[PDB]
Amino acid sequence: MTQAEIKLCSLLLQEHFGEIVEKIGVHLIRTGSQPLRVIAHDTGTSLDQVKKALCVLVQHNLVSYQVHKRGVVEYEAQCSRVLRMLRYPRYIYTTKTLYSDTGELIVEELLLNGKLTMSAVVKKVADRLTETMEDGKTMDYAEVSNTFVRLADTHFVQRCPSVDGIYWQANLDRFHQHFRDQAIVSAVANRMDQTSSEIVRTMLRMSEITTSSSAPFTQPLSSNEIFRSLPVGYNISKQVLDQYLTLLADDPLEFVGKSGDSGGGMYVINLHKALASLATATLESVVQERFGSRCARIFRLVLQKEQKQVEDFAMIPAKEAKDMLYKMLSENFMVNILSAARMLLHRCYKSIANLIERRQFETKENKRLLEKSQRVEAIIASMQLQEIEEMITAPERQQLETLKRNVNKLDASEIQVDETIFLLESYIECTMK
Numbered sequence: 001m002t003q004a005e006i007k008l009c010s011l012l013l014q015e016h017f018g019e020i021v022e023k024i025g026v027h028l029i030r031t032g033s034q035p036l037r038v039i040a041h042d043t044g045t046s047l048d049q050v051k052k053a054l055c056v057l058v059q060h061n062l063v064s065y066q067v068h069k070r071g072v073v074e075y076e077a078q079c080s081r082v083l084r085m086l087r088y089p090r091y092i093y094t095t096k097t098l099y100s101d102t103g104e105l106i107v108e109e110l111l112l113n114g115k116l117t118m119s120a121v122v123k124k125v126a127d128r129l130t131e132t133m134e135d136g137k138t139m140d141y142a143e144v145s146n147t148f149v150r151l152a153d154t155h156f157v158q159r160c161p162s163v164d165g166i167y168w169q170a171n172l173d174r175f176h177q178h179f180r181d182q183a184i185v186s187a188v189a190n191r192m193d194q195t196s197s198e199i200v201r202t203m204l205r206m207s208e209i210t211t212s213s214s215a216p217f218t219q220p221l222s223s224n225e226i227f228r229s230l231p232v233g234y235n236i237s238k239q240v241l242d243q244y245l246t247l248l249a250d251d252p253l254e255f256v257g258k259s260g261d262s263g264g265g266m267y268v269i270n271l272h273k274a275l276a277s278l279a280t281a282t283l284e285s286v287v288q289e290r291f292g293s294r295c296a297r298i299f300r301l302v303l304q305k306e307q308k309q310v311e312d313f314a315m316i317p318a319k320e321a322k323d324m325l326y327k328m329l330s331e332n333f334m335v336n337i338l339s340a341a342r343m344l345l346h347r348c349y350k351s352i353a354n355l356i357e358r359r360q361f362e363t364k365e366n367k368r369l370l371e372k373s374q375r376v377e378a379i380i381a382s383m384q385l386q387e388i389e390e391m392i393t394a395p396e397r398q399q400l401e402t403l404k405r406n407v408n409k410l411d412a413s414e415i416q417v418d419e420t421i422f423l424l425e426s427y428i429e430c431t432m433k
Helices: 003-030 035-042 047-059 079-113 118-131 143-153 172-190 194-205 221-227 239-247 271-291 293-304 307-314 317-332 337-365 369-383 394-430
Strands: 062-066 073-079 155-158 168-170 256-258 266-269
Touching: 003 035, 003 047, 003 073, 003 143, 003 337, 035 047, 035 073, 047 062, 047 073, 062 266, 073 079, 073 337, 079 118, 079 143, 079 155, 079 168, 079 172, 079 394, 118 143, 143 155, 172 194, 172 271, 172 394, 194 221, 194 239, 194 266, 221 239, 239 256, 271 293, 271 317, 271 394, 293 307, 293 317, 307 317, 337 369, 337 394, 369 394
Parallel strands: none
Antiparallel strands: 062 073, 155 168, 256 266
16 A cells, blocks of 8 residues: 555554554545445444544544535545654644744644634633643633634644534644745755845745645746845845845755746746755665765765766775675665655655554553553642652662653654655655656
């Protein structure tokens, strides 16, 4: 489908929703759009267990339903939407960044609890922000409400589609468009300068409503329309802008291109070139992370430019060079951009699956101890307290903290591997022209 993708979907549906939901979800992912009775029959599950499983998956925006030909309700699940569960910590973080704890909680609630009306969200968030507050002061629902409206305006939050519209959901495409723009801007910043990245940031912002999250180029923009829409904080004159725009167009990176000229010169953002570059950068990262600085140096050289001309420009030992070329061809790096991006994506799905399995293994192996911890924590809630904590012995506390540290490392790795998955998927889907 791939099987890496199914295994990963299965693991996520199990960890969050358990046995039956995982069976039904993986069934729909594998077999496609079908009515309730076919699901029950094909999975050897009772209509009652199927009904509850579909309810949990619809609630959590993982299953959609549509009325077909003879008025029969069919259900569908898509593999990618299940895979985006790995991206939830990032979506929540990205929101915090743009709309503070108020925005962070709005998106956290929508993703974690699924479909909810605006009222449900405002009531949950305002109540959550009030508990974190020191005696009194209170959280004004009006401000939580304004944050919600700003999110909906900037499309980070949208009403679920009907066949209803009373429920809200996070718009993953919107986060995806933002992550793409952010990656490009950061790349322009660390290679060129602050003004260059700011111009590119302005250009991508004025492209938010005009270009799709997977297009290879932005809509052409004049220097005048870019100048008009520049941030107020920037005191850059139109002469300084045209100077930077031609400096951006005439760059080895090739992120900005003159499409017209025209008044006062038409400029596009080479989104595909920008992604190809980010992809090659992560590939280099993986080469150094696995085979070292030597192998990574010779890989970088293969990206620029036959061993007759290769070894003559390598500037490293001949016997050493031969060893490197084997490791990179066999492990599929040596360089074809897409092919190597596609295989690393595949390896990423295998990595995250191993990460989850290891965590599930660690928590299962310490189930009795974790239960002892939870029980001790719960007793502390009722209103000396030192003796109830002494239940968990010094060796036990060492094991729990070790487990917390291990899980936290595995969780952090999961987010890290998914940051790579985003870059690969983005490059791969952009390369569909």
